[PDB]
């Protein structure tokens, strides 16, 4: 139907906008501790610990599979990402204050994206 084209035009151009903030979010890990999935041969105790990882990579799969339907559910896999962060590593820690310091950039671009996101529908 025309109607199912149109709302995947719409789900397309979210792709776009997502791709965008992806990005935007992934430049304030310069040191890349978020880039890829926490190694299972290497910390082999982990989903003992976290039962939902996340990662940019595996985020950036979903988004190019059209997967994220709303900003909401972009969003929760990013909180995922530092929340995941937060509780396996102590403050004290790189890992940690990396995951602050992505959390407090990253708000700044996800409230022009939800503006951007509502504006355009």
């Given at each position: 139907?025309?109607?199912?084209?149109?709302?995947?035009?719409?789900?397309?151009?979210?792709?776009?906008?997502?791709?965008?903030?992806?990005?935007?979010?992934?430049?304030?890990?310069?040191?890349?501790?978020?880039?890829?999935?926490?190694?299972?041969?290497?910390?082999?105790?982990?989903?003992?610990?976290?039962?939902?990882?996340?990662?940019?990579?595996?985020?950036?799969?979903r988004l190019e599979?059209?997967?994220?339907?709303?900003?909401?559910?972009?969003?929760?896999?990013?909180?995922?990402?530092?929340?995941?962060?937060?509780?396996?590593?102590?403050?004290?820690?790189?890992?940690?204050?990396?995951?602050?310091?992505?959390?407090?950039?990253?708000?700044?671009?996800?409230?022009?994206?939800?503006?951007?996101?509502?504006?355009?529908?």
């Open positions: 139907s025309m109607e199912q084209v149109a709302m995947e035009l719409r789900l397309t151009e979210l792709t776009r906008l997502l791709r965008s903030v992806l990005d935007q979010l992934q430049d304030k890990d310069p040191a890349r501790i978020f880039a890829q999935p926490v190694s299972l041969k290497e910390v082999p105790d982990y989903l003992d610990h976290i039962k939902h990882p996340m990662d940019f990579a595996t985020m950036r799969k599979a059209q997967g994220y339907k709303n900003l909401h559910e972009f969003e929760e896999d990013f909180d995922l990402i530092i929340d995941n962060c937060m509780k396996y590593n102590a403050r004290d820690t790189v890992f940690y204050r990396a995951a602050v310091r992505l959390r407090d950039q990253g708000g700044v671009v996800l409230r022009q994206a939800r503006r951007e996101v509502d504006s355009i529908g």
